[PDB]
Design a protein around this ligand. Structure first.
Ligand SMILES: [Zn+2]
Lengths: 77, 91, 96, 52, 249
RNA sequence: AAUAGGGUGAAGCCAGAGGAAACUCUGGUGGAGGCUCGUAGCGGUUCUGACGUGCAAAUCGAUCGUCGAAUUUGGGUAUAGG
RNA sequence: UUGAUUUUUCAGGCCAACCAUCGAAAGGGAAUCCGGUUAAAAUUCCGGAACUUGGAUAUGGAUUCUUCACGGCAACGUAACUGAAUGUGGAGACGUCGGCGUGAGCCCUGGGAGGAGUUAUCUUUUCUUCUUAACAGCUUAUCACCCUGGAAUUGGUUUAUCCG
RNA sequence: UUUUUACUUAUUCAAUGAAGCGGAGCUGGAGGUCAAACUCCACGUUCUAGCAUUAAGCC
């Protein structure tokens, strides 16, 4: 499994022709220097690797989710 | 302090094998564990590997020597004998 | 005799001890003489005298090793080669 | 080693993944100095091939 | 009686030499055109320990005169030979320690080792540590050279036979006592199965001609004829004399 | 492939003390040895113990030897009846 | 081994020291892990996540008008970044012991969040859960090496005195 | 018939991936040259742990 850091690279990767499905995982975390925040992991399943993008911003996650290709099957966990 | 009066390196053998054999061992075993001056780099870093093999830690030169000394007296004589006979042939 | 001349240069004149200092002094043209110990490796020796050929510097071949070359210079360490920058009260340059 | 890229198995120099830096340096200097002396021994030989 | 321990060694079942750790056969180069007419130069790469041998071996790399290839030779290291030394072999090689020269090219008194009995056999005489061959004289009309072997024997060899200048390295090995049965065990662990030795006088009459008796004793003269047969040659075979050697021989 | 834990304390090295020199003494450090006490292990001393139609065609118990090497051991392999 | 030839013919170019074969389920050796599952199988099944070897093969990137890339004084760095015959090396690949150092697992222990036990008395108590695989990326080291500089009032330095 | 030593092809020993053998001739260094150039020797590698392979050149 490979982690993706660049959000722009992730959207270009999610529209690759071999991408079967996607996973949106929500983790209720806390930074211990504040209070609860909602982390989101976007996971793209390619032929060889699963690619994960960690989005700690609860608003950038929602914008990113609607920026994925509409054809991908998305599982919400 | 001085730990042993006379056995020295052969004190590892205890009381065994006979005193004459242990003092005969001591002479040649001090020589084989000594550090010798390197004729190549000038440092005193030459130690024995196996018999006849003497390596320098510094310059990594290996020279063929004696069983327990870097040079035997017989080899030193041959070195001068060969040197002398070489001069006459080459004038 | 040259040992006495070399000892005087160390006492009164200018010099560098060591291979790296000698090569720098040949590059800068500050060397008057290069002295090489007998047990110096030939590759290092044949390179020092190539530097001296380019630099037009005489080379003196010491007869002893780097242990004996060091003690002539009054040092408690080994000197494989040295360069004379300024022969002072001595006359080593006129004899070599 | 068969399944890794070439930059992992070599160094960008002569004898890169085979010899160390100091051993390559000694080869270069030895090659230059010895071949320079080969010319000197040749011209000197030609000096003794016309007067002796 | 029974087949005695002398005779069981020829079958060579458990009496072959332990040769796993040996570093190759020590030989001179094959006598070729370069050695017959000029000299060839090699460089000492290694000086190594050969298990079962007192003398260290030298690995010397030569160029092949006819194809692009390196040839590694296994020489017996003479004392004073060092790694990186240039070794010269041939008729025109100079008289320096480690060089391989024909016997006729060496003046009288030259100390030489790994000498060829016959031209091209690649070394037979004076190969053990501390040993050497002295050149006594030459007979140029017959192309022969007189040498003295480590045993004190005088031999006449072809002047084309080769030898290596110097003394075999590793000498003085015998000066130190072994002090232990374990030291002899380790000595023969990489040579062959010849240690330890049971005395034949301590066996039974089946095992040895010396076995048996109500005291341990040989019973008959232990000097045995040269014409005796296998199973009889136990003791001093063809002994010209016996007893403590007194005076010169 | 396997081999607790201790004792002793060889070379080498550091420091101090004494001496004109040749050299000597002391305190540490170090960790040698087919060294040593002693487990596992390997062996098999004595009880001339048990048993002796046995648990066993050689075992059982205590006692004992040795226990870092000429050590112990699996597998592969070689040697075959005068 | 190539250029092939479709002419199913070839043209050649290199070499043939050595090289039948058998011989290890403890030597050498390409590549997999976790969770779950059976009455009985599991590194084999299920779920997920990887890897190696062989083959085919396109796209992107890279490179070329100074044709087969740039940077760094250097040790060397990188996403790539021609290379036949032949040759030279390296890895495979190597005893044993001693102390020292680092890591991992285990042992020990504090706080907190749970569960169980003791509770005539005492015990903020006794026991227990609090875990993280192969694999991918970045970072991380003794040793070794490079540049600078030129050292006696010798200095650095290990438990073990070696280095300049 | 016996003794000795000459030959090499039988036979025997050894080596090599059967690489340079034997004779002669080119080139120098020499003999003192007393015809006329005869005889002898050599005939590309030695401060250095580099390199040498798949012919350039001339006709
Ligand atoms: Zn050295």
């Amino acid at each position: 499994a490979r982690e993706i850091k660049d959000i722009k690279e992730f959207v270009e990767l999610a529209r690759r022709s071999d991408i079967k499905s996607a996973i949106v995982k929500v983790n209720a975390k806390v930074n211990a220097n504040g209070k609860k925040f909602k982390q989101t992991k976007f996971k793209v399943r390619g032929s060889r690797y699963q690619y994960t993008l960690v989005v700690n911003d609860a608003s950038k996650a929602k914008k990113l989710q609607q920026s994925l290709p509409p054809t991908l099957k998305i599982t919400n966990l | 302090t001085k730990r042993t009066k006379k056995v020295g390196i052969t004190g590892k053998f205890g009381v065994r094998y006979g005193s004459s054999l242990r003092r005969q061992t001591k002479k040649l075993e001090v020589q084989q564990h000594a550090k010798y001056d390197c004729s190549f780099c000038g440092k005193r870093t030459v130690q024995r590997g196996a018999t006849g093999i003497w390596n320098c830690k510094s310059c990594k030169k290996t020279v063929a020597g004696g069983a327990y000394t870097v040079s035997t007296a017989a080899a030193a004589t041959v070195r001068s004998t060969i040197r002398r006979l070489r001069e006459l042939a080459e004038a | 005799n040259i040992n006495s001349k070399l000892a005087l240069t160390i006492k009164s004149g200018k010099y560098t001890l060591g291979y790296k200092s000698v090569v720098k002094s040949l590059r800068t043209g500050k060397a008057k003489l290069v002295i090489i110990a007998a047990n110096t490796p030939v590759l290092r020796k044949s390179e020092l005298e190539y530097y001296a050929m380019l630099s037009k510097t005489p080379v003196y071949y010491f007869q002893g090793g780097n242990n004996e070359l060091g003690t002539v210079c009054g040092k408690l360490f080994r000197v494989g080669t040295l360069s004379i920058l300024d022969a002072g009260d001595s006359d080593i340059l006129s004899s070599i | 080693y068969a399944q890794v890229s070439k930059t992992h198995k070599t160094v960008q120099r002569a004898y890169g993944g085979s010899r160390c830096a100091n051993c390559v340096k000694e080869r270069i200097v030895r090659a230059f100095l010895i071949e320079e002396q080969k010319i000197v021994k040749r011209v000197l030989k030609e000096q003794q091939d016309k007067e002796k | 009686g029974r087949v005695i321990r002398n005779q069981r060694k020829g079958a060579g079942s458990i009496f072959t030499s332990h040769t796993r750790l040996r570093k190759g056969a020590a030989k001179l180069r094959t006598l070729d055109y370069a050695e017959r007419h000029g000299y060839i130069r090699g460089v000492v790469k290694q000086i190594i320990h050969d298990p079962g041998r007192g003398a260290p071996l030298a690995k010397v790399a030569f160029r092949d005169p006819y194809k692009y290839k390196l040839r590694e030779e296994t020489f017996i290291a003479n004392e004073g030979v060092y790694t990186g030394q240039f070794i010269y072999a041939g008729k025109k090689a100079s008289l320096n320690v480690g060089n391989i020269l024909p016997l006729g090219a060496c003046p009288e008194g030259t100390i030489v080792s790994n000498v060829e009995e016959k031209v091209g056999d690649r070394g037979a005489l004076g190969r053990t540590s501390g040993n050497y061959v002295i050149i006594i004289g030459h007979n140029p009309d017959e192309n022969k050279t007189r040498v003295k072997l480590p045993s004190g024997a005088k031999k006449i060899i072809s002047s084309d036979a080769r030898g290596v200048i110097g003394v075999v390295a590793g000498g003085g090995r015998i000066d130190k006592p072994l002090l232990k049965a374990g030291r002899a065990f380790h000595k023969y662990k990489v040579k062959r199965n010849s240690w330890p030795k049971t005395r034949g006088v301590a066996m039974n009459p089946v095992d040895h001609p010396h076995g048996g008796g109500n005291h341990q004793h040989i019973g008959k003269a232990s000097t045995i004829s040269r014409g005796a047969v296998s199973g009889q040659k136990a003791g001093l075979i063809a002994a010209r004399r016996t007893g403590l050697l007194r005076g010169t021989q």
